[PDB]
Amino acid sequence: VGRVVVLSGPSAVGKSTVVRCLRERIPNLHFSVSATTRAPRPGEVDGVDYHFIDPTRFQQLIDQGELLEWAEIHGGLHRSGTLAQPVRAAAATGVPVLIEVDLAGARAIKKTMPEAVTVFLAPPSWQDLQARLIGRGTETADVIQRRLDTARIELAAQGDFDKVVVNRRLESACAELVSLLV
Numbered sequence: 001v002g003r004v005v006v007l008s009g010p011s012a013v014g015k016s017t018v019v020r021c022l023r024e025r026i027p028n029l030h031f032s033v034s035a036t037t038r039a040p041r042p043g044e045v046d047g048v049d050y051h052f053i054d055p056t057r058f059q060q061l062i063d064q065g066e067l068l069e070w071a072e073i074h075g076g077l078h079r080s081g082t083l084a085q086p087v088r089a090a091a092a093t094g095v096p097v098l099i100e101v102d103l104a105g106a107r108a109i110k111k112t113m114p115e116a117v118t119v120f121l122a123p124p125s126w127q128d129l130q131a132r133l134i135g136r137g138t139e140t141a142d143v144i145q146r147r148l149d150t151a152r153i154e155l156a157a158q159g160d161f162d163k164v165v166v167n168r169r170l171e172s173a174c175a176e177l178v179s180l181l182v
């Protein structure tokens with residue numbers, strides 16, 4: 001059986017370069033391909049970038065328990081979520097699976113698939129994360145204040161996760177995740 005790992009973290013502790021490292025380091029890693037009810041953009045491939053389905057199908061899948069998690073996107077412009085079947089079929093074939101989702105999606109997946117390992121990718125310190133949120137200072141005080149507030153709420157509940165990987169350095173955070181996946 002392949003391990004299923006669910007990778008989450010703060011709304012912006014930066015996860016896309018970590019994900020890219022992982023897919024580079026594990027040759028046959030299955031990166032979960034989400035279902036969505038929005039339209040393809042040019043260059044998006046059905047089955048690779050998303051499984052493109054229609055609102056009616058999506059509701060059918062919700063009703064039959066075929067989603068590990070789903071959410072309304074942009075206040076309900078459309079819907080996205082993680083399909084259960086590809087994840088289970090890949091693991092049964094022996095391929096390792098990575099699901100990358102926001103904290104609400106990680107929380108939902110632990111209920112629908114308890115044997116998934118949940119990983120919270122933590123910053124090496126508060127000041128490290130705060131520096132990154134202030135960034136180039138091109139946002140207003142109110143926006144920055146909201147980001148810092150959001151970040152502390154999210155940080156406060158990393159305890160709910162099976163594992164905390166501290167992102168001290170790309171290579172060792174990536175190494176820790178490889179060890180979990182294979």
Ligand SMILES: Nc1nc2c(ncn2[C@@H]2O[C@@H](COP(=O)(O)O)[C@@H](O)[C@H]2O)c(=O)[nH]1
Pocket residue numbers: 034035038069070071073080081082101102105
């Ligand atoms: N809950 C959930 N949200 C997703 C999923 N896939 C993408 N999203 C959310 O919707 C996305 C919008 O990205 P886009 O539509 O530009 O690919 C991101 O904000 C992402 O957090 C998913 O599988 N489940």
